[model samples]
Target: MFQQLSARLQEAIGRLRGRGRITEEDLKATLREIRRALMDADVNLEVARDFVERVREEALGKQVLESLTPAEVILATVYEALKEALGGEARLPVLKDRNLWFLVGLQGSGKTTTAAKLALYYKGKGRRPLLVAADTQRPAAREQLRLLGEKVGVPVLEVMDGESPESIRRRVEEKARLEARDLILVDTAGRLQIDEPLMGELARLKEVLGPDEVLLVLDAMTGQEALSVARAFDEKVGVTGLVLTKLDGDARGGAALSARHVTGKPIYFAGVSEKPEGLEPFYPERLAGRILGMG
Candidate 1:
């Protein structure tokens, strides 16, 4: 996913390798190149600018000037900067006696797939999870989740047509009590873009469900517009965390870089593969190393 961005960043940093001395102009030029690389990879312009600004301050304020290995020191500064932008550390959703997670995102952002994968992920942790299909707008969305639930051995709760949010909550609560399912993963409906009706529906469901986590699933391949989508969703529904899907695809992964920075939310998980076991917890250090050509 970060293949292209990684290569570009590494190439930019390669110029400073084994340098005996670094001048002000040299650092400025390098920072310019780094900013360009980030923007070329589809990172939000503002986010990219802020990232480089931090790197600049650190590079200048730190003792990189007197260090014997100035290149390595500057590289470390960039690595740390990138890691902080990627959320500093891994933050997983809190597990509770009765946990409810509401998944929201644009249509085709892989919400259904992520819900099923999350079901399998928590199931392996000995969590009794129930997949609730609250996407009544999309035809067969419930069926898709139902089939995935069967594959994952988790129960699926299908929402009937014209069902109120309160009714769904009642049914889900009752079913969870009866089945002893502690974790509830509700896959909500999404639209092509952020619409008022979609926002209203999601807000209503979120209010009734009182989800412990409102994870906005984002397709890494969506590139630039993904930031706006993240902002819109957060402004409307108040996302607690982010779930990045399709990291296995040949995407630059700029959204994954800028998502947390832009949305002010932590990226809890990433969809690395299409298989049920493909979802992995987001690790900022590992990803930062990979981007810096250290991993």
Candidate 2:
């Protein structure tokens, strides 16, 4: 998604070929290019400005102008700044000690699919996780989760028709305790956008069940819109972290950069493929490289 930035950076780095030192003029030009690249990637104006300023300040203070590998040093500084903007090595919430996790997001934001993926991920890690179908609004959402759960060999918690989501969550939690399932994933219903009723339902569920982690899943194609969704969820339901889906289809990956910055939340996992095993932990450098077309 950062094609412009990547191209500019490549050109900037190329300028250092066979060079023993860099000049202030060269660094300034490169920094300006970097600034332009971030702005083009749909980054929030203030965030882009502040990030560029930090990169410039760090690059100058480090005396990169006199370094033999000035370009590499400057790139490393930018990478570190990018990672810092993305929550800086924060650990994902531990599911080993807790029995339940609640996945929340808007409809079409991949919440249901992510629930199945998370169940499979935990299963692979030797945790017996049950997928709880709390989403009753969609005609086939519960069935989808059940089928996916079956494919992954994890149990799906059945939901009675017309039951309250809050009550369903409590029942699921009790079942997890009784079944000795190490993890219980609650896949809740999602609206097209942030609606009061949907958000209220989530808040009530959180209050009643007290899930160990409340994760907000988002679509990467929506870019800054995803960041806004995250903010709304954080304000209303208080999400513990984020799960970004459709990354493989995300051309710019700007959403990843923006979501983490705006929400101040760790990105626990990313959906890179439709395969059940495609979901993986977030890696800043690897994602950065992919954005730059280096991976």
Candidate 3:
């Protein structure tokens, strides 16, 4: 997903290597390359500025380990800075027995499919995850969840229009309890944008289900606009985490770097592919390593 940025960062870092002790000027040159790389990746102006400043301070002020050379020290500092920009290390939330997770997002943001993918991910991890299509706004989403639930060999609890969120929650709890499932994944409705009715519905559903997590499914291709989307939802509904999808898009995938920092919410997962197995847990260190070509 970060292939271009990764290659760009690696190319810049490679320039700093195969040289003698790097002075502040030399370090600044490498930092400039990174600054340009971050800018080209569609990172917000302030985010990139802070990122470069942090890395620059670390390079100039932080003491180097005796075992590491000047070039190695600069590389390590850059890696640390990248991790910081990406929100450091975050542990994935463990789904407790009968835990409910609500997947909500704007229309066309891949919420329905992401719920199924999340269910499949947990299922592959040796837990029984049940799907609840509580998205009455998108009628097709119910059938979609059903089909996906069938594919994953899990059961789907459909949501009807007349049923209230409390009633739906009761049904979900009872179904999961009877289905012998350990996790309950709820797929909620979405609008083309953040509106009162959409947010209110999701907020009410979250209250009724008292979900363990309220994850917003975002399209990573939205770039800086993702920041606004996240802020709006978080302001109204109090998002617990994020599931960034379509990261494989050509647009640098820098939205990931901004999402957490802007929203103050950790990204729980990233969708790298369209297949059910495409979901991957978010790890700042791992993502930083990939960006810096450590692999």
Candidate 4:
């Protein structure tokens, strides 16, 4: 996804091999290149600035190891810093008790699809997941979830028309308890954007369900807009983690990186494909290396 940024860094680093020593002046051009790479990749404007400045400060602050050349020292430091920026060693909690998780996001952010993928992904991890269609706003919301449930080979909790959000919440808990499913992924409705009343609606539902985690399903192609939406979600409904979707497209990845930086939440998963099998855990180190020209 960050092929351009990776190539840019690799190219700048390759030229470092010919240098006598990396003077601050010598590194300045490459630092500029690094910032430009991040900016060009659609990274959050402030995030890009902070990342490059931190890289510059870190690069100049360290003394090269006795055995290593200046370039090697700088390369390793940059990799380490990048890893830190991407998130250092992500760990998540296992749903031990109620085990309810809500998939929340704006409409068309692939929230429903990600919910299905999550069910399939958790099944692979040996946890039976129960899918809940709490999104009653969309006309086809129930049917859409049913199809996803069928596709993922999982069961969906069916609620009645007159059933309130409170009722749906109880339905989820009752079904999970009866079926002995350890994980419950709730698919909630979303508005076109972050509206206060809609967010209030989601928050009330969240209060009713009392989910263990509220993972925001974010669109990877949103670029910097991802940050604004995520911060709004985190502020209003409170996101536990993020699930980035539609990574097969214009996912050059400033969105994922910026979203994490802004929200202070771990990226739980990424939707790499349109199918249920597309869900994969967020690989921070792998993506860090990829952006630094590592295969």
**Of candidates 3 and 1, the better by lDDT:** 1
- Candidate 1: tens digits of C-alpha lDDT, residues 1-295: 4888878777877778877778778888888998998888898888899999998889778866666566776788889988988899899878979899999999998899999999999999999999999999998899999999999999999999999999999999999999999999999998898888879888888888898899999988887677678777877788999888888883487888888767889999988888888898999998888777663
Expressed as tens digits, the lDDT of each residue in 1-295 for candidate 2 is 3565567656666677677787888778878877777777677777778888888889888888778888778777777777766666756667555577889998998888899899998888888898988888888888999899989999998677778757686688688788888888889888897898778878877788788888899988887878887777888788998998998777665777777668888899999888788797987766666554566
How many residue pairs clash per model? Answer: 0, 2, 1, 0
Candidate 3, residue 282: how far the Cα is off, in Å? 1.4
TM-score of each: 0.94, 0.91, 0.91, 0.91
Scored by TM-score, the top model is 1
lDDT winner? 1
lDDT of 4 at 192: 79
* Order of candidate numbers by lDDT, starting with the best: 1, 3, 2, 4
Task: Report the error of model 1 at residue 30, Å.
Answer: 1.3
How many backbone collisions does model 3 have? 1
Candidate 4 lDDT by residue in tens digits, 1-295: 5666667777777777745566666677777887887888788877788887777777667753222356776676668767777777765556575578999998999988988988998888788999988788888898999998998889998666657778787777778888998899889889877888879888888888888899988888887686678777877777888888887785367787677678788888878888989877777787677677665
User: How far in Å is the alpha carbon of 208 misplaced in model 1?
Assistant: 1.7
Cα lDDT tens digits, model 3, 141-227, are 788999999987888999887688889977888888787888888888888777887787777777777888889888888877866
Deviating ranges (above 4 Å) for candidate 3: 62-70
Stretches of candidate 4 above 4 Å error? 64-70, 160-162
Candidate 4, position 98, lDDT: 51
Please give the lDDT score at residue 63 for candidate 1. Answer: 64
